[PDB]
Amino acid sequence: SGAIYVGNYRVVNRHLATHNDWANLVWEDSSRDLLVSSTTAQGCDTIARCDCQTGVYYCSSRRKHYPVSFSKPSLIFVEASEYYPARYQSHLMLAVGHSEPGDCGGILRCQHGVVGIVSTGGNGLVGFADVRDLLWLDE
Ligand SMILES: COc1cccc(NC(=O)N2CCC[C@H](C(N)=O)C2)n1
Ligand SMILES: [Zn+2]
């Protein structure tokens, strides 16, 4: 689990969105596994606006933050799960790192701010849904 709290927005994995998120919906995209809802309180996270390919992510299944090198956001095939059929997910970045299903939502960050959140994984890989192109999160 986990979210990004920037301005009056809450960014979560679409597959983990709550009823309150759907009832206060700002934007959602199944192909990216992202959903953004509105918040009453202002958040403290800042979004990175950069082309970093190295950063650090939080892994809840280890209670640890790990440094990683990650691929550029791309269209990657994701196998069928209990949340989606087998499909291509867009704006996804892959890295070598530990992950379990419940790790979704952990933040990936670089020196400039939040880059994205954990969205896929398995067998010593971890995938992050990028948010750096969502310029509207800053206003
Ligand atoms: C997060 O790490 C792991 C580790 C092992 C397995 C998994 N499951 C995983 O990738 N998916 C299940 C949740 C929805 C994901 C998606 N974005 O389509 C696919 N995740
Ligand atoms: Zn950066």
Cβ-Cβ contacts under 8 Å for 19 (sequence gap 6 or more): none
CA 120 / ligand 1 centre spacing (Å): 4
Q: Is the CB of 101 under 6 A from ligand 1?
A: yes
Q: Is the CB of 32 under 6 A from ligand 1?
A: no
Q: Domain of residue 20: give its range.
A: 3-44
**Rounded Cα distance, 93 and 119, in Å:** 9
Mutate to test the pocket of ligand 1, among 14, 104, 107, 128 (most ligand atoms within 8 A of CB): 104
**Rounded Cα distance, 63 and 130, in Å:** 22
* 90 and 130 inside one domain: yes
**Rounded Cα distance, 131 and 61, in Å:** 23
104 is catalytic: yes
Q: Length of the chain, please?
A: 139
Place of tokens 């192909």: 31
* 135 and 71 inside one domain: yes
**Rounded Cα distance, 2 and 88, in Å:** 23
Cβ-Cβ contacts under 8 Å for 63 (sequence gap 6 or more): none
Question: Is the distance from CB of 116 to CB of 2 less than 8 angstroms?
Answer: no
33 is catalytic: yes
The resolution of the experimental structure, rounded to one decimal in Å, is: 1.4
* 59 and 117 inside one domain: yes
* 114 and 79 inside one domain: yes
* 34 and 90 inside one domain: no
Amino acid at 48: A
Residue 84: which of 131, 124, 31, 123 has the closest Cα?
31
Based on its alpha-carbon atoms, the radius of gyration of the chain, rounded to whole angstroms, reads: 14
Phi, psi of 135 (to 5 degrees): -65, -30
Method: X-ray
CA 139 / ligand 1 centre spacing (Å): 30
Report the number of distinct structural domains present in the chain: 2
Query: What's the sign of the alpha-carbon dihedral 109, 21, 63, 98?
Result: negative
Q: What is the DSSP string of the chain?
A: ---EEEEEEEEEEGGG--HHHHHTEEEEEGGGTEEEEEEEEEEE--B--S---EEEEEETTTTEEEEEEBPPSEEEEE---SSS-SEEEEEEEEEE----GGGTT-EEEETTEEEEEEEEEETTEEEEEE-TT-GGGG-
Bridge partners for 129 per DSSP: 92, 117
Q: Is 44 annotated as a binding residue?
A: no
Phi, psi of 22 (to 5 degrees): -65, -30
Q: Is the CB of 76 under 6 A from ligand 1?
A: no
CA 124 to chain centre: 18
